[model samples]
Target chain A: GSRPTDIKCSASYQCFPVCKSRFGKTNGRCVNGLCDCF
Target chain B: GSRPTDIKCSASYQCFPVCKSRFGKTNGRCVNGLCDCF
Candidate 1:
């Protein structure tokens, strides 16, 4: 299990594509405006 | 508008508490499986 370090955002929807684009996968979530990618 | 950066996770729900604790707020969402915090 990977741990989320730091990733800030304004909304959850905003991180969707971001995480997908970065990690090249669809496993992203916005927790308190932070993008947690793993 | 803030941009989402590198972040990864296994599930969306997993990012909620993590983001909350990180940013000290409740403006997080799970898009795909990454944590998006703002």
Candidate 2:
């Protein structure tokens, strides 16, 4: 299964929430030092 | 000053969030399968 996702962080210069992989591949953004699990 | 941190997971058997470098050291938990950035 493949779906688009997004995780936001209200802080800066800090590691965002972790986005652990489930299926195969996982890629997203790290806005302001956050991991946007998208 | 130094403090202890705790990380939780909403699932099981998974790599918790990636905690990028911060200060001198950083370590927590990979809950059921999540990271409890404490």
Candidate 3:
């Protein structure tokens, strides 16, 4: 299931794909060093 | 209120903070050409 969690983003470009790679097959985001998947 | 939406990310640095500025108030991220805030 989709959920939000902490995921370090050293580079911005790495944020989205990093999140999507884990969850949120549909969509995801990296904010404040956290990953929000939906 | 915190919500996710389509927000363009010209640069990676602009991803999270940009989304946070719009919503999330606490956190946000740019993923898949969209901004996800939580």
Candidate 4:
């Protein structure tokens, strides 16, 4: 096992897929380096 | 003030622009009803 660092992003490319699970299979976005869901 | 509900999507259209920020304006997408990114 490995320790996972905080999930951050600089653009949408680094956001979408990462935010997928973060949003629990719901709509999400990387707003301000965070996962924003609607 | 307002309460925001959860977000979910069924297609990429609901992903791209939305995840444009959840990733801090980097990049994003909607996979499995959630935001997915690279």
Docking class of 4: incorrect
How many clashes does each candidate structure show, in the order listed?
A: 32, 8, 2, 24
TM-score, chain B, model 1, is 0.46
Q: How do all models score by TM-score?
A: 0.37, 0.24, 0.37, 0.32
Error of 4 at A30 (Å): 16
Report chain A TM-scores, every model. Answer: 0.54, 0.29, 0.43, 0.37
Cα-lDDT of candidate 2? 0.35
Query: For residues A6-36, what per-residue lDDT tens digits would candidate 2 score against the true structure?
Result: 3334442122233334222344444653444
What number of backbone clashes does candidate 3 have, counting pairs of residues 3 or more apart or in separate chains? 2
- The first chain of model 4 has a TM-score of 0.37
Worst 10 residues of 1 chain A by lDDT: A11-20
- Model 3 TM-score on a 0 to 1 scale: 0.37
What is candidate 2's fraction of native contacts? 0.12
- Give the number of the best model, judged by TM-score: 1
Ranking by DockQ: 2, 4, 3, 1
Sort by TM-score, best first: what order?
1, 3, 4, 2
Pairs in steric clash, model 2: A18-B17, B7-B36, B8-B36, B9-B31, B9-B34, B11-B32, B11-B33, B12-B32
Instruction: Compute the interface RMSD for each candidate structure.
Output: 8.9, 9.6, 7.9, 8.3
TM-score of chain B of each: 0.46, 0.28, 0.44, 0.45
Find the 10 residues in a row with the least total lDDT in model 3 chain B: B17-26
Tens-place lDDT digits, model 3, residues A1-38? 66776777543434555554565244555577676666
lDDT of each: 0.55, 0.35, 0.56, 0.46
